[PDB]
């Protein structure tokens, strides 16, 4: 029951990074952009259900700075921002702290479930937290249902409503606003569904809104089949967004519907190497000039579901842009190094356009330009196989990112693109169980 089925788990985390970026307004100096060493640690209590109907979850984490270079930018998203509320953010520093990231009543009744309080989305909608080591947190509620039809498939759906949020690098919640940071968005809500036909074919879709401002869409089809005894997995994904401000004010983001479509393939070869081939295509006409999967435009103010992630620094999400990604991860078990893996990946993207109009354009703004970007990354991972520290993981990731233009960072009507970088991340993740 509620006591007997309780669990208490957590982890200790270590992160060290060095990233530099080209300033094409001072020669082309690769200047320090991030340089810090930071710890996290968390405790997560999840109760059982009294009478199979009522429970409680409570979880908290701390972040402790260890080193930071004076030229490191802020916030680094592993420590806490010195600005506790997202809409106060002024980019001037980072700090240590303790955050309550889960605190919720949970309910079950037949096929129905619900959660309320300080929560993460967990069902079928398109709301989502940001993830660092730990997730961001919404103030609100979600309810959903699950119906199993045996071999004929299974249906799930849910609805969530929220009026405040905090990213994992913010110690306090803030409300929602339009692009101007002052016109109120009273709530975000979303409804979605999933149908699993139990033949490896699965459909998902969802709709969301930011009150008075943005309508958001999500749809995904996936399928897998065996090729030579091993599954090839495929998916088609659609993300869309439309706004309700088209007067050419600061709050006017998109002309028409903006969207991102994607195709993915995955396959494990010779039972030893995981291969990925993926591509994306974006349309984002209007003042902003890039696609967002979240329903509020300001950095850190909320997040939305996005199943595409290439860990190659850029978002590759500019108006018109096409991108293709290839990744390989090689399991070294047959060299008798079980738990050891090495990888490499590459991206090439073309046809990236800027915003279609600008109110105070800069020297470099050219409505009809197109640009390109590319990147490649290397990866090394080791997970402890047995003993006291079984499952503790060490990871090293290197990216080299190349902007194929001379436009300075964030300039030219390309408001989400920055300049060439080199990035190195080292992390350690050490989970534990108390009971």
Ligand X SMILES: CCCCCCCCCCO[C@@H]1O[C@H](CO)[C@@H](O[C@H]2O[C@H](CO)[C@@H](O)[C@H](O)[C@H]2O)[C@H](O)[C@H]1O
In the complex, least distance from residue 64 CB atom to ligand C8E, rounded to whole angstroms? 5
Strands (E), 272-339: 273-283, 303-304, 322-331
Instruction: Give the Cβ contact number of residue 428 at 10 Å.
Output: 14
Instruction: Give the Cβ contact number of residue 413 at 10 Å.
Output: 23
Q: Does 402 bind Mg ion (CB under 5 A)?
A: yes
* Cα–Cα distances in angstroms (integers) from residue 97 to residues 111, 139, 169, 302, in the given order: 39, 20, 10, 21
Nearer to Mg ion, 154 or 232 (CB): 232
Choices 2-10, 224-232, 341-349, 417-425; region in contact with ligand C8E by CB under 6 A: 341-349
Sign of the CA dihedral with 426 first, then 76, 343, and 307 last: positive
Using DSSP's 3-state secondary structure scheme, residue 88 falls into helix
* Cα–Cα distances in angstroms (integers) from residue 402 to residues 41, 258, 279, 375, in the given order: 34, 26, 18, 6
In the complex, least distance from residue 138 CB atom to Mg ion, rounded to whole angstroms? 38
The residue behind tokens 């490499």 is 344
- Please answer whether residues 372 and 352 qualify as being in contact, where contact means their C-beta atoms are separated by less than 8 angstroms: yes
Q: Does 219 bind ligand C8E (CB under 6 A)?
A: yes
Q: Which residues contact 378 (CB under 8 A, 6 or more apart)?
A: 342, 343, 344, 397, 398
In the complex, least distance from residue 235 CB atom to ligand C8E, rounded to whole angstroms? 7
CA atoms within 13 A on the CB side of 59: 26
Nearer to ligand X, 92 or 359 (CB): 92
Q: Does 376 bind ligand C8E (CB under 6 A)?
A: yes
Cα separation, 322 vs 227, whole angstroms: 29
- Please answer whether residues 433 and 24 qualify as being in contact, where contact means their C-beta atoms are separated by less than 8 angstroms: no
Q: What, of ligand X, ligand C8E, Mg ion, none, does residue 172 touch, CB below 5 to 8 Å by kind? A: ligand X
Interactions with Mg ion, residue window 209-238 (CB under 5 A): 230
The residue behind tokens 């059982």 is 48
Q: What, of ligand C8E, ligand X, Mg ion, none, does residue 64 touch, CB below 5 to 8 Å by kind? A: ligand C8E
Interactions with ligand X, residue window 47-76 (CB under 6 A): 60
Choices 17-25, 97-105, 207-215, 247-255; region in contact with ligand X by CB under 6 A: 97-105
Choices 120-128, 281-289, 334-342, 409-417; region in contact with Mg ion by CB under 5 A: 334-342
Q: What, of ligand X, ligand C8E, Mg ion, none, does residue 173 touch, CB below 5 to 8 Å by kind? A: ligand X
Residue choice 197, 223, 340, 346 for contact with ligand C8E (CB under 6 A): 346
Q: Which residues contact 199 (CB under 8 A, 6 or more apart)?
A: none
Cα 404 from chain centroid? 25
- Please answer whether residues 38 and 69 qualify as being in contact, where contact means their C-beta atoms are separated by less than 8 angstroms: no
- Please answer whether residues 160 and 190 qualify as being in contact, where contact means their C-beta atoms are separated by less than 8 angstroms: yes
Q: What, of Mg ion, ligand C8E, ligand X, none, does residue 420 touch, CB below 5 to 8 Å by kind? A: Mg ion
Give the contact letters, 143-172, x = binds to ligand X (CB under 6 A), - = no: ----------------------------xx
Give the contact letters, 261-300, x = binds to ligand C8E (CB under 6 A), - = no: --------x---x-x-------------------------
Q: Does 98 bind ligand C8E (CB under 6 A)?
A: yes
For residue 262, is the peptide bond before it cis, meaning its omega torsion is within 30 degrees of 0? no
Cα separation, 36 vs 426, whole angstroms: 11
Q: What, of ligand X, ligand C8E, Mg ion, none, does residue 402 touch, CB below 5 to 8 Å by kind? A: Mg ion
Locate 52 and state its tokens: 């199979």
Using DSSP's 3-state secondary structure scheme, residue 251 falls into coil
- Please answer whether residues 123 and 191 qualify as being in contact, where contact means their C-beta atoms are separated by less than 8 angstroms: no
Choices 96-104, 186-194, 318-326, 413-421; region in contact with ligand X by CB under 6 A: 96-104
Q: Does 96 bind ligand C8E (CB under 6 A)?
A: yes
Give the contact letters, 159-198, x = binds to ligand C8E (CB under 6 A), - = no: x-------------------------------x-------
Sites of contact with ligand X (CB under 6 A)? 60, 97-100, 171-173
Sites of contact with ligand C8E (CB under 6 A)? 39, 62, 64-66, 68, 95-98, 122, 143-145, 159, 191, 205, 207, 217, 219, 238, 240, 257, 269, 273, 275, 307, 326, 328, 344-346, 376
Sites of contact with Mg ion (CB under 5 A)? 230, 268, 271-272, 334, 402-403, 420
């Amino acid at each position: 029951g509620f006591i007997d089925d309780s669990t208490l788990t957590g982890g200790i985390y270590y992160w060290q990074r060095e990233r530099d970026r080209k300033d094409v307004t001072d020669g082309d100096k690769y200047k320090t952009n991030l340089s810090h060493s930071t710890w996290n640690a968390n405790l997560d209590f999840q109760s059982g259900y009294a009478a199979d109907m009522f429970g409680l979850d409570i979880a908290a984490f701390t972040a402790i700075e260890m080193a930071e270079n004076g030229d490191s930018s802020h916030p680094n998203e592993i420590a806490f921002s010195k600005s506790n509320k997202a809409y106060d953010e002024d980019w001037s520093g980072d700090k240590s702290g303790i955050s309550l990231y889960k605190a919720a009543a949970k309910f079950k009744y037949g096929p129905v479930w619900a959660r309320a309080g300080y929560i993460q989305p967990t069902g079928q909608t398109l709301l989502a937290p940001h993830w660092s080591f730990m997730p961001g947190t919404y103030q609100g509620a979600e309810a959903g249902a699950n119906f199993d039809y045996g071999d004929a498939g299974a249906l799930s759906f849910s609805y969530m409503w929220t009026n405040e949020y905090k990213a994992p690098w913010h110690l306090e919640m803030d409300e929602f606003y339009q692009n101007d940071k002052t016109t109120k968005v009273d709530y975000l809500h979303s409804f979605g569904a999933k149908y699993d036909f139990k033949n490896n074919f699965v459909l998902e879709a969802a709709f969301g809104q930011a009150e008075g401002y943005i309508d958001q869409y999500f749809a995904k089809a996936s399928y897998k089949f065996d090729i030579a005894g091993s599954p090839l997995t495929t998916s088609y994904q659609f993300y869309g967004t439309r706004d309700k401000v088209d007067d050419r004010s600061v709050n006017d983001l998109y002309d028409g519907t903006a969207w991102l479509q994607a195709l993915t393939f995955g396959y494990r070869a010779a039972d030893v190497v995981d291969l990925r081939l993926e591509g994306t295509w974006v349309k984002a006409d209007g003042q902003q000039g890039y696609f967002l999967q979240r329903m509020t435009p300001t950095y850190a103010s909320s997040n939305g579901r996005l199943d595409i992630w290439w860990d190659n620094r850029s978002d590759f999400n500019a108006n018109g842009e096409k991108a293709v990604f290839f990744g390989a991860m090689y399991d070294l078990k047959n060299w008798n190094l079980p738990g050891f893996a090495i990888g490499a990946s590459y991206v090439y993207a073309w046809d990236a356009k800027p915003a279609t109009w600008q109110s105070n354009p800069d020297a470099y703004y050219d409505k009809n330009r197109t640009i390109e970007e590319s990147a490649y990354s290397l990866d090394a991972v080791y997970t402890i196989q047995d003993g006291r520290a079984k499952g503790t993981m060490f990871k090293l990731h290197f990216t080299e990112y190349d902007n194929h233009s001379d436009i300075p960072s964030w300039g030219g009507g390309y408001g989400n693109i920055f300049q060439d970088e080199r990035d190195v991340k080292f992390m350690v993740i050490a989970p534990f169980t108390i009971f």
